[PDB]
Design a protein around this ligand. Structure first.
Ligand SMILES: CCCCCCCCCCCCCCCCCC(=O)OC[C@H](CO[C@@H]1O[C@H](CO[C@H]2O[C@H](CO)[C@H](O)[C@H](O)[C@H]2O)[C@H](O)[C@H](O)[C@H]1O)OC(=O)CCCCCCCCCCCCCCCCC
Ligand code: CLA
Ligand code: CLA
Ligand code: CLA
Ligand code: CLA
Ligand code: CLA
Ligand code: CLA
Ligand code: CLA
Ligand code: CLA
Ligand SMILES: CC1=C(C#C/C(C)=C/C=C/C(C)=C\C=C/C=C(C)/C=C/C=C(C)/C=C/[C@@]23O[C@]2(C)C[C@@H](O)CC3(C)C)C(C)(C)C[C@H](O)C1
Lengths: 177, 31, 174, 365, 78, 142
């Protein structure tokens, strides 16, 4: 069993059936079996949404329309505009949330025009999701500690790796932005 | 005068058509 | 069995046999074999007209430096209408009839009358006709609605959406 | 493993030889496993369509990149003093000095100066704006598409030709000599008389006015009466500026010889007469072999007749027709020899009798 | 042949009737504005007339004889 | 046998035995073979006369002597080398029918356009989208 940490200890509730089981739950948050299925739904959801986010945080900063934290106010989008979007998104959300957490369609609604559903693709979805979820966490924290755009952060680190890293950055008063 | 960004877009999307036909002809020639 | 939406119930009248069936009839207008047959004719015929229509709208302006398709201030519609109806009358009749005889049923299929010099008729080409037809019908609806909302030519609409994608939408008018 | 699937011998090899020898034998169709004559001719015919499409896409890309990133219209204002541009450079590896070094024209960035002579050729045959170029680019993309579709189609079993169709020499020679060579030459004469020569004399003629705009003041009446000389009457003067009407003429078909004094290129009306005269020869040539109408020569009969009575050539050209008709390598050898000679001809003739405007002044091209 | 010949002769008759009668009455008392709406009204009816519906013996000679007079009367009237 | 329409069932009397029969008679004339014989005489004659007229209507205008509508101010045996095969027989039929539709053409065009048939061709070739049937009839026609 491939696990998240070396030594060979998995929780009992995490058996190795579901996609992405790496024996990782040291806080026992999926010990109860009914909560597990909801969480299995929301991991994929959070994952897909972050995937979209992370691609949407880089592409308009490449194109030179400002960084992601200064991209709302740079093209308008106030709190009323997020309210109208949130009302519009609600319809699809309640359509999603009318079904149970035990139905496989609650994660996998079947919209597959290319017919690329295998098991390899489900694990690949979950892995790219968790990578994008940590990447969003990274974006937010970097935003506050360094106070510049993420592409700037990457470019400084590639050009001057000792110069600009977490160690340098965290030795100044960091909540700056 | 200067070719516009719109005319670049139309050129690209048009070019997708012989890409598909290329794929078709390739597959056919490959037994 | 292909479906118009994922995780759907194909209704029992639609069987998977006739070209273009993707299990879509929520109002149920094709229960009888005969009314389905007639609506099939009407679908293909609406399709073929729409395809001629969408070409006939785009191509003059794009290739022959004409104006928008909804600028009818060049001609008197009544004169063209009278001429057109005189010309179209025997054609649409002979189609409906089935032939030149009075009790016309003299061979042709009434949807697929066999006007193919090149010999290209099969199920695949039939499905291609239906799919191009449905797309062209959708497009022609778009042309009409766009005409009444923007008041601008369809190519102009495409140019303004391409130039400024965030502000020339249906959600901002254009 | 699996690759290459056309050779089991290679596909059993357990070494890296399999990969290399798989790539190097892929187009040698005769040596493929279980190859028949039918299948051989049909894969050749399709690949030929594929080559055509690649050539039309290449041209389409030259037109596109010059219309989008070049300076064709500026060059047209001052041909002898502006350098033509091929495309832009987008190399992340460059430094700021290299960016400043390769930045030449009014384009915002580093470019490559073009040395292929396409600017001179496009300007001579009548194109004048980046929209012209762009529309040409789009047309050629469409012709590519047609070729690729034809390739696929003629690979289908209903349209796959039989070997007898491939071995019909007399018909091919008639069609290729009368139409491909002949009618395409006559068409080019039509392009020159209807579009290029006007543009050289200032008149702007395009698809939206060519059907009205008379290419000669007298129309086709001279042609049909037999007063052909009227088409040579008033040629351009030796003081003519290319592209303007200053010192311009009316003639459409001449035989002046030598070069236009400003452009230092051949006269366009001599190029139009040339294309028209050889069209007439090729069309007459293409009516020589026997197809399906009882008139014409059979090539085997010509071959079999030519034998010297002394016997110094033996049985002469007896048996050659089946030899050549059944051998693709003979045919490829004869084609490549012919093309070889013609390519040197084009090199030896284009530097000495330059046919394009302002090209001899461009020394690097 | 006679199958349709009958029905044409009937229709030509009733046509001639309305024409010859309603030629006198405006006399004794444009053609594109109203011709278009005539053909536009004639097309849904004359289809159903021909089709048989909405689908995809004295007066069997009296009106033919009076019709043939109205046909020949119009031939004079032209 | 080729037919004038696809998929139509041909009449029983029209079966391929004559030069250039394409099974076309959807009103019913040639049902009795005697009538079909006299019509065959009429069609060959009117065709030959139409083809004569076609040359006699174009060639005067081509020369430049004047326009044809302003100027008003069976197989017999005559033949050297017998090329009379079913091919050539049918060819004569075809070219005759074509030239009849031609002469139908000129006798409508003279009234619609009021110009010569050559000039009609030249003006189409000079302004296709403005000098066709759909632009001559669309506006009130002399
Ligand atoms: C880029 C791709 C790199 C790959 C090329 C290297 C591979 C060379 C190679 O494997 O080479 C070996 C190949 C393969 O040899 C073939 O090898 C075959 C191998 O047999 C296999 O296939 C046989 C088929 O009969 C049987 O199936 C047999 O069982 C099986 O073992 C046979 O032995 C054939 O007889 C033999 O022809 O040799 C050849 O003939 C090579 C093909 C000749 C092409 C001619 C090229 C000449 C161009 C040179 C000039 C370049 C100039 C560039 C100018 C540019 C300037 C800017
Ligand atoms: C969670 C996903 C997500 C969210 C919330 C957004 C939200 C936004 N996008 Mg982004 N975007 C996304 C994914 C997303 N995008 C993805 C996947 C891509 C690549 C296709 C982009 C590529 C993109 C571009 C090129 C642009 C936007 C822009 C915008 C902003 C204006 C949108 C509008 O008004 O209409 C808005 C804040 C616009 C903007 O103003 O950015 C500064 C803009 O120009 N987005
Ligand atoms: C505003 C209307 C609307 C409604 C009714 C819903 C409803 C829902 N959301 Mg959604 N959501 C919305 C807007 C909405 N959302 C918007 C605008 C976003 C940002 C794109 C999200 C992002 C989002 C995430 C990340 C998650 C949900 C989840 C859910 C489900 C559980 C919520 C819950 O635990 O409540 C208590 C009762 C529920 C179906 C959760 C879910 O699917 O859990 C399985 C979940 O993880 N939503
Ligand atoms: C004029 C250029 C040209 C043309 C017309 C062909 C044509 C062909 N090649 Mg060749 N080939 C070429 C250049 C070309 N090739 C070059 C530059 C190389 C690299 C040196 C090769 C190496 C090569 C190999 C190794 C093989 C072929 C094969 C083929 C045949 C199958 C088509 C195919 O590639 O499948 C796939 C087509 C595509 C992926 C199309 C590209 C679409 C774009 C989006 C076809 C006859 C195959 C064959 O089966 O030979 C019998 C084969 O195995 N070619
Ligand atoms: C001028 C005379 C004329 C006549 C006799 C017809 C007759 C017909 N039309 Mg045609 N049609 C006409 C003009 C005409 N049309 C014109 C000017 C157009 C616009 C180009 C059409 C476009 C058209 C469409 C889209 C359809 C018809 C259909 C029909 C048929 C069914 C009518 C029906 O549903 O009745 C009521 C019962 C019938 C053969 C219908 C059909 O074929 O469906 C089976 C159909 O869908 N017609
Ligand atoms: C079938 C193909 C088709 C295509 C390629 C387009 C393309 C376009 N439409 Mg049109 N339109 C269509 C069908 C189509 N529409 C239909 C069926 C309707 C009736 C709902 C409309 C009604 C419409 C309006 C009112 C407007 C557009 C606009 C546009 C442009 C901007 C995108 C947009 O916001 O539209 C939204 C598209 C839809 C609501 C239909 C989506 C259908 C596809 C297949 C999914 C773009 C050129 C806008 C414009 O003109 O910008 C300048 C605009 O204001 N469309
Ligand atoms: C056919 C030859 C050809 C060649 C050699 C090039 C070369 C180039 N193009 Mg251009 N391009 C072409 C045709 C060509 N183009 C055509 C016809 C169009 C209109 C659709 C374009 C539209 C275009 C754009 C928008 C851009 C380029 C760019 C470039 C440059 C970088 C590569 C790239 O990003 O293109 C990416 C490729 C495309 C966008 C589509 C290319 C379509 C062609 C037909 C590819 C197929 C080639 C050939 C048939 C494959 C056979 C090879 C095989 C035997 C091994 C490079 C100079 C970039 C540039 O300008 O950098 C400065 C750039 O932004 N091209
Ligand atoms: C409109 C649909 C239609 C189609 C698909 C055809 C198709 C054909 N016609 Mg027909 N034809 C038509 C209408 C049509 N025709 C009409 C309205 C007339 C005038 C009454 C004719 C008069 C006609 C003649 C005189 C001939 C044809 C012939 C042909 C064949 C060539 C081909 C099968 C030819 C043929 O049958 O040769 C094989 C032939 O000689 N057609
Ligand atoms: C087919 C029967 C026919 C008839 C009735 C006429 C009748 C006439 N011709 Mg024509 N003509 C015909 C065939 C015919 N021509 C043919 C086949 C040729 C080519 C040899 C000519 C060449 C011809 C010329 C050159 C002229 C006539 C002229 C005339 C008119 C004197 C008279 C109306 C004269 C005329 O007035 O036309 C302008 C005249 O100059 N004809
Ligand atoms: C299937 C189904 C359903 C459905 C449905 C749907 C969406 C059906 C709708 C069909 C739709 C959306 C479209 C029709 C056709 C458009 C045509 C024919 C256009 C002609 C075009 C022509 C001929 C135009 C001609 C011209 O433009 C030319 C060329 C030049 C101009 O200058 C002038 C004019 C204007 C003359 C339900 C109801 C949802 C449920 C049910 O259970 C099952």
């Amino acid at each position: 069993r491939p696990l998240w940490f070396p030594g060979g200890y998995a929780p009992s509730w995490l058996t190795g059936q579901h996609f992405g089981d790496r024996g990782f739950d040291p806080a026992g948050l999926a010990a109860d079996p009914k909560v597990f299925e909801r969480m299995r739904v929301s991991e994929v959801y959070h994952g897909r949404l972050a995937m979209l986010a992370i691609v949407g945080a880089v592409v308009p900063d490449i194109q030179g329309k400002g960084a992601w934290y200064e991209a709302a106010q740079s093209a308008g989008i106030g709190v009323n505009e997020v309210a109208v979007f949130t009302a519009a998104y609600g319809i699809a959300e309640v359509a999603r949330g009318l079904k149970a957490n035990s139905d496989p369609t609650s994660r996998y609604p079947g919209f597959d025009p290319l017919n690329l559903t295998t098991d390899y693709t489900k694990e690949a979805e979950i892995k790219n999701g968790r990578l994008a979820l940590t990447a969003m966490l990274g974006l937010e924290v970097q935003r506050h500690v360094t106070g510049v755009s993420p592409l700037v952060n990457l470019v400084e680190h590639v050009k001057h790796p000792l110069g600009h890293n977490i160690a340098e950055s965290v030795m100044h008063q960091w909540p700056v932005a | 005068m200067e070719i516009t960004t719109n005319q670049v877009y139309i050129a690209l999307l048009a070019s997708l058509i012989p890409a598909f036909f290329a794929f078709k002809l390739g597959k056919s020639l490959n037994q | 069995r292909l479906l118009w939406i994922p995780n759907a119930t194909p209704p029992a009248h639609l069987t998977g046999e006739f070209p273009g069936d993707r299990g879509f009839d929520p109002l149920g207008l094709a229960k009888d074999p005969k009314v389905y047959q007639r609506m099939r004719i009407s679908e293909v015929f609406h399709g073929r007209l729409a395809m001629l229509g969408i070409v006939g709208c785009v191509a003059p302006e794009l290739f022959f430096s004409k104006g928008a398709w909804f600028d009818y201030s060049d001609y008197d519609l009544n004169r063209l209408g009278l001429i057109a109806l005189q010309v179209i009358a025997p054609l649409e009749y002979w189609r409906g009839n089935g032939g030149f005889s009075w009790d016309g049923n003299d061979g042709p299929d009434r949807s697929y009358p066999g006007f193919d010099p090149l010999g290209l008729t099969n199920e695949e080409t039939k499905l291609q006709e239906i799919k191009n037809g449905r797309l062209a019908m959708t497009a022609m609806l778009g042309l009409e609605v766009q005409s009444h909302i923007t008041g601008k030519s369809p190519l102009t609409n495409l140019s303004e959406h391409l130039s400024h994608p965030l502000s020339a939408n249906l959600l901002t008018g254009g | 493993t699996k690759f290459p699937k056309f050779s089991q011998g290679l596909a059993q090899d357990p070494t890296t030889r399999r990969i290399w020898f798989g790539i190097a034998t892929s187009h040698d169709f005769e040596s493929h496993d279980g190859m028949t004559e039918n299948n051989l001719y049909q894969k050749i015919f399709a690949s030929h369509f594929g080559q055509l499409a690649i050539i039309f896409l290449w041209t389409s890309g030259n037109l596109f990149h010059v219309a989008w990133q070049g300076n064709f219209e500026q060059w047209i204002k001052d041909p002898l003093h502006i350098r033509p541009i091929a495309h832009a450079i987008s190399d992340p590896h460059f430094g700021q000095p290299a960016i400043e070094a390769f930045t030449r024209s009014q384009f915002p960035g580093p470019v490559n100066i073009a040395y292929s002579g396409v600017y001179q050729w496009w300007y001579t045959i009548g194109l004048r704006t980046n929209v012209d170029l762009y529309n040409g680019s789009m047309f050629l993309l469409f012709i590519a598409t047609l070729a690729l579709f034809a390739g696929w189609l003629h690979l289908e079993p209903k349209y796959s030709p039989k070997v007898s169709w491939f071995k019909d020499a007399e018909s091919r020679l008639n069609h290729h000599l009368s139409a491909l060579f002949g009618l395409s030459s006559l068409a080019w004469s039509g392009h020159l008389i209807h579009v290029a020569i006007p543009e050289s004399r200032g008149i702007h003629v395009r698809w939206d006015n060519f059907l009205s705009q008379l290419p000669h003041p007298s129309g086709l009446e001279p042609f049909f009466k037999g007063n052909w000389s009227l088409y040579s009457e008033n040629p351009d003067s030796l003081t003519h500026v290319f592209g303007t009407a200053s010192g311009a003429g009316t003639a459409v078909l001449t035989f002046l010889g030598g070069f236009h004094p400003e452009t230092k290129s051949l006269w366009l009306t001599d190029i139009a007469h040339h294309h028209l005269a050889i069209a007439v020869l090729f069309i007459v040539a293409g009516h020589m072999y026997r197809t399906n109408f009882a008139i014409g020569h059979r090539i085997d009969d010509i071959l079999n007749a030519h034998k010297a009575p002394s016997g110094k050539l033996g049985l002469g050209h007896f048996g050659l027709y089946e030899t050549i008709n059944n051998s693709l390598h003979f045919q490829l050898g004869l084609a490549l020899a012919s093309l070889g000679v013609i390519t040197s001809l084009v090199a030896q003739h284009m530097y000495s009798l330059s046919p394009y405007a302002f090209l001899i002044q461009d020394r690097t091209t | 042949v006679y199958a349709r010949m009958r029905v044409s002769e009937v229709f030509h008759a009733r046509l001639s009737m309305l024409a010859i009668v309603g030629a006198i009455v405006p006399e004794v008392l444009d053609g594109i504005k109203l011709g278009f709406i005539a053909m536009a009204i004639a097309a849904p009816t004359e289809y159903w007339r021909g089709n048989g519906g909405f689908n995809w013996d004295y007066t069997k000679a009296a009106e033919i004889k009076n019709g043939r007079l109205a046909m020949a009367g119009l031939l004079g009237l032209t | 046998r080729g037919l004038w329409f696809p998929n139509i069932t041909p009449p029983a009397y029209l079966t391929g035995e004559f030069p250039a029969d394409r099974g076309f008679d959807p009103a019913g004339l040639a049902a009795d073979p005697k009538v079909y014989e006299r019509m065959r005489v009429a069609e060959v004659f009117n065709g030959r006369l139409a083809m004569l007229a076609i040359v006699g209507c174009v060639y005067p205008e081509l020369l430049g002597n004047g326009v044809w509508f302003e100027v008003w101010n069976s197989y017999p045996g005559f033949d050297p080398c017998n090329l009379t095969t079913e091919y050539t027989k049918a060819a004569e039929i075809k070219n005759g029918r074509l030239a009849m539709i031609g002469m139908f053409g000129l006798e409508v065009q003279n009234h619609v356009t009021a110009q010569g048939p050559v000039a009609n061709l030249i003006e189409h070739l000079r302004h296709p989208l403005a000098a066709n049937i759909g632009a001559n009839l669309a506006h009130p026609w002399p």
